[PDB]
């Protein structure tokens, strides 16, 4: 299936993390075709500077055989 | 298509594919002489299947606007007609729905919504290319197309 | 309405209702009595509202089941017309869509598609309802009552 | 995001300094502006679809883009970009209502550019059809409030530019 | 601001604004002019409730790190509760309490217990800057901006408020 | 739902318009929304305060709880006990904007007696410790100049009333 | 799910020995019916959106459970009504063509009549809306695969009571 | 079986068969007769599969638990045997190896070296037995069999 | 995608029918089958046969294997074999497709990233990719052991 | 992560031999090193708090990267900052404990640079509170314990560099 | 090591590592003297212990590919069973059989079968290392070594 490689920082600004439930913000990802305008939409919901998409699987102008 | 499906189930448990999968592409390979004959049939006579199928809609559905007065949405209606059944000539020809789903009949209803046409209009109409599928194909050929058709079908 | 999500969102981010707040829900319960005597006019116009509405509908939209030989489906339309006005009131009382959205348009799309009625015809129906609402209301009163009607509209405009 | 209020207050925070008298006007012409900001908004959320079925109509269709080899064949692209549009104008409300074009920013032009490119979407017909939605709305809200949501439909079209 | 928090609660759901969110809206901006005219009486005022309350809180408080004889420490003091008076004229300008949560009550007790205040003397200056405030400026006027007081003083009062 | 939406579900669901009954209680709600207001203003300014010294006098009366065989003995069971004070001020406050119950019907009576059962937490202290609650948020509301406290006194007795067991 | 191959398999696995003469016997006549079956899983998924449309109007519309106070009344319960018309359909498709009801007894009837009954959903009125589909689903396939079907919508009523 | 693989493709994306699917039902039930001939031929003439297989491979491998004299032993790796090909007949009429997998090659390992057997051991056993069934079907059975037989020795 | 699916997509693009040179590559494709099934047969039927012969007759017995090299440790030995069945399972699903567009889009991208990036060597990998062909060639013939040693050599191509 | 044993065991292992003489030299002064690391500890996790206090007084305020439009402004980013600085001193602590700064390699190190330039945090700023927090370690530990926490926090800031 | 699972455990709970692991910190220091004492004696008998453990594994397990006649292959086994008393003196030093583990048995069994011999006669080889070490080390150090022989058993 086609795969989208995504960097993104995705910072927190409702929550102060104690000491473990700071994870990382920074990160990169191979993010499926299917939910990469969810994942799009949810770290800019919460405030992702998204800096680096690129399409990690599969060709561009693809009338079939994507998946 | 129907091989790309058999190596994805392979690859979905990381495996080789099982006894059934060659089975059925032994059955998808000595039945491609006879999708192979109707995909030439389809686009020998996809005019003919245009222009009944498009006489049947409009003497079954006329408050489209496919015949509204407009030429250009007319003609438009006659190449989506030539379109669909290419796409169910591509879909015999691939073995699977595929190519109709990634082309045709996943985002239908929106778009067609879009464009403000009903879609039970554009159902009506699959069903008259559909019949007219049946008129022109044997009994096989026509139920190997009626498949697609009622895939089309289902997705309005 | 928005004192029921002034209160979720106090609820979400845990805390009080901040004064802010305090004041929208002032000026909510202000704005009051203006809503309840627009609704009190609604319940006083809503049938007359239904006639004309259906005959501007009949007129902007002839080929329509309502307009068929078949009384059946005039009369369930004709209800229907009658019960987005019911609820179109309520969503005036209210001052928001909750029982509007609650009612009539979640899942208004689902059920006339499992009618087959097309959605497009209601969407037009509900703008002739709208026309002749707004001319059964004074100027602030359409400011108020249109936006409810636009609202319905747009939950079927797809 | 920020809207109008939220540029003035952090513009004013981020010097230690209570908001000054030409920020006090700034906000003055901002709630002179809400009434006619939220009829617009609302006029927007009626005529969504009717927006995007022009707007598509008069930019993206009859041309080689819609037909086989375009961008908006094979029916599943042609709903992804009516899903672009339904989300460039919802944005573009939000914009206008907020008065501050940061929700752009943050929440299309941020990614949008990248994945079009990623995907090979053509960036150039995208901005030339949201200049149509722009025109579309400035033909059936007036001139003044269909401006200002122009305003940010500029944006979004600068931002992909 | 209003403005802000129904746009973020209307892009969650993926919806344009409901009608009833557009009447909260035209509300606030109805107010607005009135809530600018508070947020001038605070811009007016607020150097004098800071000067009365730190008086007021070393009078009453001695034990106070402004109270020990720097300078830079005092000069903080004041420039810490001038800053919370801005914040609330923000809240007054926004019509919500996000410029004081978002800017100064969210990880504001980490933030002192860090830098070594103790928060209890910080509660009891907050107390008096309200005192002062509820005096100097009016009685209207106070009804808008001691409530936004109130919310910054119930951040921190809450080891447990003393009885028997 | 408030008082305006439950009114309004309810005749939805029976399929009436609204006839001068409802506008005459939907107009009353409006009239009273002024005091509703004031007392969650009132409740947002003390309610550390209200929730606090509510706890501490019935730990007064109720000795037990403190007491080392009490269900609020340590100060995490103490924090605790007080957090669930600060729970039900707030979302009674939640109920005093609304006027209606359904707040505390959706989010403080949804399992409330089945959590209080699986750790052993005692019933009645709570449902004590919220009178003193209302009785507090009463006489501040008197002493701040509201007349009627009628609408402050109907949220605490519904928690009351729905944890409460049948003697 | 246990298709009727699979059923089979296990009770001669629990005896123990290979699939007993009768057993090849009843294996024999689902792998005969299965053509037929196919014929009439591919009618049901053509048809499904008019098979509970019509079965909807005959046993559900113009009734007082369409009326205020009725449970189809605010369209998302409506619609809520033809998803579990959609779900009834498709599983006992998924039965008739697997040819056991082991999927009806595991995807739907466990535990359907305990959450009806919390939702307050008429289990009467579903079981006349079921065998209401029966009688549709027969109308266009003809008695045989009709009947065949209807087995699983008589299980599916059975389940219900 | 593959049927129930194919209702469960059909679920978990809320659609309907696809024509494509209803024709891998087709195909298996035209044979399924086939299938119950070659069940047939192994319920037949398992008990010599299993004294073959055991014969060959006691001759390939001495060093086992079912040759160290213990007869309940090698009565244990006969039934073992015996109830695998009954496995592998089961795979042959259900279309698919989803029966021989959950009755004998799920928690196949972990059974097996609690009974501190080693595991090539019944690997290569497996190896003789299908041996044993090539040497005793017709090539197309020989080729079916042969397959759940190979999927056993990729379980082990 | 695969050979049928590359053939409608170029006739998708060009927007007409597969015409007689595209029907031709589909015959051949139709052709083959048959023959790549049995292959498919005997790849699935002793694939870690293979993958032991190769390690064998290419890995083994250089320092690669021995201390600071990078099968050294049980699980880089296990994680190599784990590659080496991952390439011979996807050549494999190649040949059943006709086209490399599998290993173009599942094995091949950020491999050679990966493997330089934690010190694998692409020489010896290559090494014994090639002989797994050699070995496939070796098991099923000429014929079939060309086609599937031509994504091998596809393989090989994208690792280097 | 890996500990100075650890990294003697695996050069070891990666040459195929057993621990030689400069080896096991080298895990002798680790092992005669581990009372005074294991009692640095104790003291780093027991005032954990106050390290950080005398830190970011000693670097931090009272300079404008704490002002309006700074980094450490409205009080959530400063008690990022804090929570920050504390992560820091515990996993020098780890490192410091196991004699190797594997686990800051892996854990700390490993893209913070790159997310601090995508959250514009100033690198020269926490680089000399870390510096700070080295010279608060060295005072409140000692010369020699506290140059070997140093070490570790010298690896912080070159990975940081 | 003893010391990195220790400072792993005080992670991924963001704590500090607690009295009782600065305890075995401290102790497992104390620990040190013995632990090299008994890398040194591995260390310096290790010929004869892989000398002794052939012998006695070659007298009991003679089906095995290493007294197949090939030198080869037997300096190989002889290589493997000096590395794996090798990690086990590593897993002595320490103090865990993470070196152990993570160097000769995560992908143990794998390897072996893709080397094709047999699992259980590795097993019957370490076993007789094992009494080895128990010939040539006191009780204490016996135990400690044979820990590690232990986990070797469980792995094959
Ligand atoms: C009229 C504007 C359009 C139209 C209408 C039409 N409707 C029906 C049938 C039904 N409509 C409803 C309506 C609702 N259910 C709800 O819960 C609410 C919101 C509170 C509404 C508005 C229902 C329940 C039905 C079913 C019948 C019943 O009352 O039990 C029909 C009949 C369809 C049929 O086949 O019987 C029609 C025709 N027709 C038009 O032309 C207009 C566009
Ligand atoms: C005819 C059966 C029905 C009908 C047709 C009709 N269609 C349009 C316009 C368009 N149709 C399409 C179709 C497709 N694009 C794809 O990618 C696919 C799959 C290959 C299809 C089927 C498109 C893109 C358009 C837009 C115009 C264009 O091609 O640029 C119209 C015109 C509508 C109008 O008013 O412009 C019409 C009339 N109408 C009916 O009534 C029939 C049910
Ligand atoms: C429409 C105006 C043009 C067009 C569109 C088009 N887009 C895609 C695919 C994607 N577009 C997006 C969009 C967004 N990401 C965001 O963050 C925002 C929110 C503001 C938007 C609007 C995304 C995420 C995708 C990929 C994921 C998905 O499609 O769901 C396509 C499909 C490309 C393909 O190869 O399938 C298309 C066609 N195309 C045109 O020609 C128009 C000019
Ligand atoms: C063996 C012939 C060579 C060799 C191999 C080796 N590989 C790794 C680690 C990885 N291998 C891959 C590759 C893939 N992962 C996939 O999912 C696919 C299928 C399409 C491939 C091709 C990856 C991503 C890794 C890293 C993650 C993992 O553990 O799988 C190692 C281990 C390296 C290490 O230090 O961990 C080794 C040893 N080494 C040789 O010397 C041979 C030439
Ligand atoms: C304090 C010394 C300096 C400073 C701090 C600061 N940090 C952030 C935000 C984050 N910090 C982190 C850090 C980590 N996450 C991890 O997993 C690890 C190990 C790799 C670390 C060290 C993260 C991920 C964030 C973002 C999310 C979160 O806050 O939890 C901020 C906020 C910046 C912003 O909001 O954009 C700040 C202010 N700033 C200074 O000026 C000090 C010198
Ligand atoms: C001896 C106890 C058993 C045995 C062994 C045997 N081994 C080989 C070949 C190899 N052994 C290894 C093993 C390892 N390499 C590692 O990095 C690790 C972790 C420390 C292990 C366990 C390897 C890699 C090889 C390959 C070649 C080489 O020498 O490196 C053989 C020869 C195999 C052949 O026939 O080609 C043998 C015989 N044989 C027995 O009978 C004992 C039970
Ligand atoms: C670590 C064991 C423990 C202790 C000591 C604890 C503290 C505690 N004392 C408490 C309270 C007090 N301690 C004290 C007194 C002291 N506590 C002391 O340790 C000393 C030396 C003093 C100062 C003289 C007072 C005056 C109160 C007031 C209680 C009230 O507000 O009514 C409480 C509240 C509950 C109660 O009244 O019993 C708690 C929770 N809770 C615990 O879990
Ligand atoms: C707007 C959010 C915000 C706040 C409130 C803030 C706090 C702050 N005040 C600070 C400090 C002080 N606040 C005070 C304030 C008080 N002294 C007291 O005892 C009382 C009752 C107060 C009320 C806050 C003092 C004396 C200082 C001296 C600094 C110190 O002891 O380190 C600093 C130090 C850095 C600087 O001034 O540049 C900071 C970071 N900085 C921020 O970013």
Redesign the interface.
Known sequence: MRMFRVTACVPSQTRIRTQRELQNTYFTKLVPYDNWFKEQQRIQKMGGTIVKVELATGRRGANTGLA | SLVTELILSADSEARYPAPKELRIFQDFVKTGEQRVRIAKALAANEERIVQNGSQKFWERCPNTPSNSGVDRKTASCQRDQGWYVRLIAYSILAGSERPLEDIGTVGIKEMYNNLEIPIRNIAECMRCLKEEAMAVLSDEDAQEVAAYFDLIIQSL | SVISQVIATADREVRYLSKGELDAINRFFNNGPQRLRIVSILNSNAEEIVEKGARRFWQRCPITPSNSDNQQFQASCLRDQAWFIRLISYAVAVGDVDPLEASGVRGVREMYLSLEVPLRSVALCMRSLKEVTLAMLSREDAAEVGPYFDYLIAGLMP | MQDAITTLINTSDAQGKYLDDSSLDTLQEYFRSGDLRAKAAMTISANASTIVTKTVAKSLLYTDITGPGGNMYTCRRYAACIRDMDFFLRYGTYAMLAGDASILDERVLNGLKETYNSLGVPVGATIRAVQAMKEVVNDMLGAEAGKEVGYYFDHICSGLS | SIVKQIISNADEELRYPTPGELEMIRSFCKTGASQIQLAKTLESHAPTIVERGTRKFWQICPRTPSNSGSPRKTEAAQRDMSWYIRLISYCLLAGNDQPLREIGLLGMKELYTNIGIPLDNILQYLRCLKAEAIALLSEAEAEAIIPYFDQIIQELVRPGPSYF | ??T??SL??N?????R??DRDA?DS??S???T??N??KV??M???????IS??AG??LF?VVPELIRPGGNAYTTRRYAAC?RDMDYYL?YS??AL??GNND?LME?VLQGLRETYNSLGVPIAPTVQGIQIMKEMVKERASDMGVDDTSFIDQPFDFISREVSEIS
């Open positions: 739902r408030d305006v939406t309004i579900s005749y939805d669901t029976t399929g318009y609204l506008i939907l107009q709600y409006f009239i929304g002024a509703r207001v969650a203003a409740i947002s300014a003390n309610a550390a305060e606090r010294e501490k006098k007064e007080l707030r406050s939640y904007v609304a707040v989010r």
